[PDB]
Design a binder for this molecule. Structure first.
Ligand SMILES: Nc1ncnc2c1ncn2[C@@H]1O[C@H](COP(=O)(O)OP(=O)(O)O)[C@@H](O)[C@H]1O
Length: 266
């Protein structure tokens, strides 16, 4: 499946801020009648990758909830059909082995498993443990690094057979060379033909995306190709492409540069 949004708007409604909270004054935002997103348009073909970036708290997560149906479109048309698979920014971990976490509630299939494991770069993790992917974890799997938890929860989501993959900021940790190999192997090759939406703050991901959506304040700052971006948003581009290794700054620096840049160039 592809995905289409034509001129979609969505309001704060009772309970969405708390959902937002799990997944990453609400009353007043529902009382007053307020768009969390306004005039969103995107059109994404089967098998393409949409990269979503923007300033912090611009509605990135919220756009995924709307896809998931947890937020409601008060206006506009959304089309997409099929199973969706959601990897949240929170990396949840269930009691059981690493392997049991990746296949959680889904049947085991060897070729599929081994291939997901290799492309999420889990082979370098599990090889440090005496029982490898049979190692037992407690929930939160709290002695692992953030990147280890995020790769296991990415592998779980990519292993789900679905028509659309929603991946909310997996690449936000310090082990930055691993993240680059995950993006190239999992998101770019293994998933090359699965429709997919990657929320992100690395410019390489916009560079390889089929489509790009930049959000600011609940609003679409830009939407189209990386090439259209360089030509239609030149102040944004020149500033962002003008660092020499932006993608290796910490997630917080990158997101703060993005926010400031989006603030400057509205
Ligand atoms: N944990 C939170 N507590 C209070 N307000 C929040 C929280 N998370 C997001 N918001 C607010 O809700 C709106 C939408 O946030 P969100 O969709 O999470 O943006 P983003 O994913 O781009 O960082 C923003 O206006 C933001 O300030």
């Amino acid at each position: 499946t592809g995905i289409i949004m034509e001129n979609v708007t969505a309001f704060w409604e009772e309970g969405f801020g708390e959902l937002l909270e799990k997944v990453q004054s609400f009353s007043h935002l529902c009382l007053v009648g307020n768009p969390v997103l306004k005039n969103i348009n995107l059109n994404i073909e089967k098998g393409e990758m949409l990269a979503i970036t923007g300033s912090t708290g611009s509605g990135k997560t919220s756009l995924l909830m709307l896809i998931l149906g947890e937020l409601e479109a008060s206006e506009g048309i959304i089309k997409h059909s099929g199973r969706v698979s959601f990897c949240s920014q929170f990396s949840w971990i269930m009691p059981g082995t690493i392997k049991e976490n990746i296949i959680f509630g889904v049947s085991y299939d060897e070729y599929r498993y081994k291939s997901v494991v290799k492309a999420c770069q889990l082979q370098q993790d599990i090889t440090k443990f005496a029982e490898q992917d049979n190692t037992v974890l407690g929930e939160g799997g709290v002695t692992l690094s953030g990147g280890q938890r995020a790769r296991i929860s990415l592998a779980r989501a990519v292993y789900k057979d679905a028509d659309l993959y929603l991946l909310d900021s997996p690449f936000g940790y310090l082990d930055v060379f691993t993240e680059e190999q995950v993006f190239e192997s999992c998101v770019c090759k293994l998933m090359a033909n699965k429709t997919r939406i990657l929320v992100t703050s690395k410019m390489e991901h916009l560079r390889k995306a089929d489509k790009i959506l930049i959000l600011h304040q609940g609003s679409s700052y830009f939407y189209g190709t990386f090439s259209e971006l360089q030509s239609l948003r030149p102040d944004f581009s020149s500033k962002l492409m003008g660092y020499d290794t932006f993608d290796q700054f910490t997630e917080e620096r990158r997101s703060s540069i993005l926010t400031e840049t989006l603030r400057r160039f509205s």
